[PDB]
Amino acid sequence: KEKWGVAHIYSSYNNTIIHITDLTGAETISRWSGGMVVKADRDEPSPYAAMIAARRAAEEAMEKGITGVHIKVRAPGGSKSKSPGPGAQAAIRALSRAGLRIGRVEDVTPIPHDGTRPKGGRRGRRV
RNA sequence: GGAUACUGCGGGCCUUGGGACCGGGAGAGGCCGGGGGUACCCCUGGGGUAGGGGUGAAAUCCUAUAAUCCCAGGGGGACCGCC
Protein backbone atom coordinates (compact mmCIF):
# COMPACT_ATOMS: atom_id res chain seq x y z
CA LYS A 1 0.00 0.00 0.00
CA GLU A 2 0.94 3.69 0.12
CA LYS A 3 4.44 4.71 1.17
CA TRP A 4 5.45 8.10 2.53
CA GLY A 5 8.85 9.72 2.80
CA VAL A 6 10.51 13.06 3.48
CA ALA A 7 12.61 15.22 1.14
CA HIS A 8 15.17 17.40 2.88
CA ILE A 9 16.28 20.20 0.57
CA TYR A 10 19.40 22.14 1.54
CA SER A 11 19.64 25.29 -0.54
CA SER A 12 22.51 27.78 -0.51
CA TYR A 13 23.95 30.32 -2.91
CA ASN A 14 26.66 27.84 -3.95
CA ASN A 15 24.89 24.45 -4.19
CA THR A 16 21.76 22.41 -3.54
CA ILE A 17 21.18 19.01 -1.93
CA ILE A 18 18.13 16.74 -2.18
CA HIS A 19 17.96 13.90 0.33
CA ILE A 20 15.02 11.50 0.54
CA THR A 21 14.44 9.52 3.71
CA ASP A 22 11.78 7.51 5.46
CA LEU A 23 9.31 9.27 7.75
CA THR A 24 11.79 9.16 10.64
CA GLY A 25 14.78 10.39 8.65
CA ALA A 26 16.85 7.60 10.21
CA GLU A 27 17.02 5.42 7.07
CA THR A 28 18.25 6.99 3.85
CA ILE A 29 16.99 6.13 0.37
CA SER A 30 18.42 8.53 -2.22
CA ARG A 31 20.85 11.44 -1.86
CA TRP A 32 21.92 13.64 -4.78
CA SER A 33 23.65 17.01 -5.08
CA GLY A 34 24.29 19.68 -7.67
CA GLY A 35 27.94 18.90 -8.25
CA MET A 36 26.98 15.33 -9.05
CA VAL A 37 25.50 16.39 -12.40
CA VAL A 38 27.77 19.20 -13.65
CA LYS A 39 31.49 19.77 -14.11
CA ALA A 40 31.90 23.49 -13.45
CA ASP A 41 31.62 24.75 -9.87
CA ARG A 42 29.99 28.08 -10.78
CA ASP A 43 26.82 26.28 -11.96
CA GLU A 44 26.10 23.95 -9.03
CA PRO A 45 23.31 26.27 -7.73
CA SER A 46 21.72 26.18 -11.18
CA PRO A 47 17.94 25.64 -11.10
CA TYR A 48 18.62 23.20 -13.93
CA ALA A 49 20.97 21.19 -11.71
CA ALA A 50 18.32 21.32 -9.00
CA MET A 51 15.83 19.84 -11.48
CA ILE A 52 18.15 17.05 -12.63
CA ALA A 53 19.18 16.04 -9.11
CA ALA A 54 15.60 16.05 -7.83
CA ARG A 55 14.44 14.00 -10.82
CA ARG A 56 17.06 11.30 -10.32
CA ALA A 57 16.47 11.18 -6.57
CA ALA A 58 12.73 10.82 -7.15
CA GLU A 59 13.17 8.09 -9.76
CA GLU A 60 15.36 6.01 -7.46
CA ALA A 61 12.97 6.63 -4.56
CA MET A 62 9.98 5.41 -6.56
CA GLU A 63 11.95 2.36 -7.66
CA LYS A 64 12.54 1.69 -3.97
CA GLY A 65 8.79 2.01 -3.43
CA ILE A 66 8.09 5.50 -2.09
CA THR A 67 4.94 7.16 -3.47
CA GLY A 68 4.54 10.43 -1.56
CA VAL A 69 6.92 12.87 0.11
CA HIS A 70 6.60 15.63 2.62
CA ILE A 71 9.04 18.48 2.04
CA LYS A 72 11.40 20.26 4.43
CA VAL A 73 13.26 23.14 2.82
CA ARG A 74 16.27 24.63 4.55
CA ALA A 75 18.72 27.49 4.02
CA PRO A 76 22.09 27.36 5.81
CA GLY A 77 21.03 29.67 8.60
CA GLY A 78 22.39 30.18 12.07
CA SER A 79 25.16 32.73 11.79
CA LYS A 80 24.75 32.53 8.01
CA SER A 81 22.03 33.64 5.61
CA LYS A 82 18.36 32.94 6.29
CA SER A 83 17.31 33.35 2.65
CA PRO A 84 17.23 30.18 0.51
CA GLY A 85 18.70 29.95 -2.94
CA PRO A 86 17.11 29.66 -6.37
CA GLY A 87 17.12 25.88 -6.71
CA ALA A 88 14.57 25.19 -3.97
CA GLN A 89 11.39 25.79 -5.96
CA ALA A 90 12.90 24.23 -9.07
CA ALA A 91 13.55 21.08 -7.05
CA ILE A 92 10.04 20.99 -5.59
CA ARG A 93 8.49 21.37 -9.04
CA ALA A 94 10.68 18.74 -10.67
CA LEU A 95 9.89 16.37 -7.80
CA SER A 96 6.15 16.75 -8.30
CA ARG A 97 6.50 16.41 -12.08
CA ALA A 98 8.59 13.24 -11.93
CA GLY A 99 5.62 11.44 -10.37
CA LEU A 100 5.72 11.54 -6.58
CA ARG A 101 2.81 12.97 -4.64
CA ILE A 102 3.25 15.86 -2.25
CA GLY A 103 2.20 16.51 1.31
CA ARG A 104 3.05 19.35 3.66
CA VAL A 105 5.80 21.81 2.70
CA GLU A 106 7.57 23.29 5.71
CA ASP A 107 10.60 25.56 6.07
CA VAL A 108 12.96 24.36 8.85
CA THR A 109 15.85 26.91 8.74
CA PRO A 110 17.48 27.25 12.22
CA ILE A 111 16.92 30.74 13.79
CA PRO A 112 19.40 32.38 16.87
CA HIS A 113 17.11 33.44 19.79
CA ASP A 114 20.34 34.82 20.18
CA GLY A 115 23.48 33.60 18.49
CA THR A 116 27.31 33.44 18.16
CA ARG A 117 29.13 36.21 16.18
CA PRO A 118 29.30 36.02 12.31
CA LYS A 119 32.57 36.10 10.30
CA GLY A 120 32.66 39.67 8.90
CA GLY A 121 34.86 41.76 11.19
CA ARG A 122 32.76 44.81 12.16
CA ARG A 123 33.06 46.23 8.64
CA GLY A 124 32.01 43.28 6.47
CA ARG A 125 33.33 42.22 3.12
CA ARG A 126 34.85 45.20 1.31
CA VAL A 127 35.20 43.70 -2.17
C1' G B 1 27.03 118.61 62.15
C1' G B 2 22.75 116.26 59.70
C1' A B 3 19.76 112.40 56.54
C1' U B 4 18.24 107.14 56.34
C1' A B 5 15.90 105.30 50.33
C1' C B 6 19.56 101.33 48.97
C1' U B 7 23.62 97.91 50.79
C1' G B 8 25.81 95.86 55.53
C1' C B 9 25.09 94.39 61.06
C1' G B 10 21.67 93.03 64.92
C1' G B 11 16.35 91.40 66.64
C1' G B 12 11.34 89.66 65.40
C1' C B 13 7.56 87.84 61.45
C1' C B 14 5.99 85.43 56.32
C1' U B 15 5.47 81.56 52.56
C1' U B 16 5.81 82.00 47.00
C1' G B 17 11.94 79.48 46.14
C1' G B 18 14.12 74.91 48.39
C1' G B 19 14.11 70.63 51.64
C1' A B 20 11.09 66.83 54.60
C1' C B 21 6.67 63.52 54.94
C1' C B 22 1.98 60.54 53.15
C1' G B 23 -0.86 58.16 49.08
C1' G B 24 -2.16 55.11 44.62
C1' G B 25 0.72 54.36 40.30
C1' A B 26 5.28 54.13 35.86
C1' G B 27 9.92 52.54 34.36
C1' A B 28 15.75 47.60 29.93
C1' G B 29 17.98 52.64 37.19
C1' G B 30 21.63 49.24 40.32
C1' C B 31 23.26 44.50 43.24
C1' C B 32 22.45 39.23 44.77
C1' G B 33 20.33 34.36 44.03
C1' G B 34 17.54 30.58 41.40
C1' G B 35 15.33 28.64 36.86
C1' G B 36 15.21 28.59 31.48
C1' G B 37 15.41 29.40 25.65
C1' U B 38 16.85 28.64 20.73
C1' A B 39 21.28 28.58 17.93
C1' C B 40 26.56 27.11 17.36
C1' C B 41 31.20 23.56 18.32
C1' C B 42 33.10 18.66 19.83
C1' C B 43 32.40 13.42 21.05
C1' U B 44 29.89 8.39 20.83
C1' G B 45 26.43 5.06 18.20
C1' G B 46 23.07 4.29 13.38
C1' G B 47 22.21 5.18 7.86
C1' G B 48 24.35 6.12 3.16
C1' U B 49 28.44 6.98 -0.64
C1' A B 50 31.25 10.41 -3.78
C1' G B 51 32.24 14.57 -3.30
C1' G B 52 31.91 19.17 0.02
C1' G B 53 33.46 23.99 0.82
C1' G B 54 34.39 28.82 -1.25
C1' U B 55 34.63 32.71 -5.35
C1' G B 56 33.85 37.55 -9.97
C1' A B 57 36.52 32.88 -11.54
C1' A B 58 39.82 29.74 -8.88
C1' A B 59 43.07 27.46 -5.48
C1' U B 60 44.73 26.21 -0.43
C1' C B 61 41.44 23.21 3.06
C1' C B 62 38.06 18.63 4.79
C1' U B 63 37.19 13.83 2.59
C1' A B 64 37.36 6.62 0.74
C1' U B 65 41.43 6.18 8.60
C1' A B 66 33.75 7.23 5.07
C1' A B 67 33.44 13.64 4.62
C1' U B 68 29.04 17.07 3.18
C1' C B 69 23.66 15.25 4.50
C1' C B 70 19.71 12.67 7.89
C1' C B 71 18.55 10.27 12.98
C1' A B 72 19.28 9.01 18.46
C1' G B 73 22.10 10.66 22.57
C1' G B 74 26.13 13.11 25.97
C1' G B 75 29.10 17.00 27.27
C1' G B 76 30.62 22.38 26.84
C1' G B 77 31.26 28.07 26.51
C1' A B 78 29.24 32.61 25.12
C1' C B 79 24.39 35.37 23.98
C1' C B 80 19.03 36.62 25.23
C1' G B 81 15.86 36.99 18.47
C1' C B 82 10.31 38.56 16.76
C1' C B 83 7.12 41.69 20.11
Side-chain angles (χ1 to χ4, degrees), chain A residues 3-7 20-23 29 66-71:
Chain A
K3 262 164 209 195
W4 282 104
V6 186
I20 290 169
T21 44
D22 65 355
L23 274 161
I29 284 144
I66 305 316
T67 81
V69 289
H70 305 291
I71 284 148

Side-chain angles (χ1 to χ4, degrees), chain A residues 23-76:
Chain A
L23 274 161
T24 69
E27 275 269 7
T28 286
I29 284 144
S30 62
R31 176 221 293 148
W32 274 81
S33 62
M36 272 186 191
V37 311
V38 284
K39 280 72 173 172
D41 286 331
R42 65 167 207 286
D43 288 304
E44 287 166 350
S46 293
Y48 202 50
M51 287 193 171
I52 294 166
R55 213 200 62 231
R56 304 196 61 157
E59 277 157 21
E60 158 166 15
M62 274 184 291
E63 285 169 8
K64 296 290 231 307
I66 305 316
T67 81
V69 289
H70 305 291
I71 284 148
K72 290 183 180 210
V73 65
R74 179 257 192 279

Side-chain angles (χ1 to χ4, degrees), chain A residues 64-114:
Chain A
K64 296 290 231 307
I66 305 316
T67 81
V69 289
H70 305 291
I71 284 148
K72 290 183 180 210
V73 65
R74 179 257 192 279
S79 296
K80 293 161 180 163
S81 63
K82 308 293 181 306
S83 64
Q89 315 196 0
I92 301 165
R93 289 291 319 206
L95 280 166
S96 181
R97 266 190 226 95
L100 302 151
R101 297 169 49 267
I102 303 304
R104 54 190 87 110
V105 169
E106 56 273 6
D107 174 61
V108 286
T109 310
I111 311 289
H113 288 171
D114 207 317

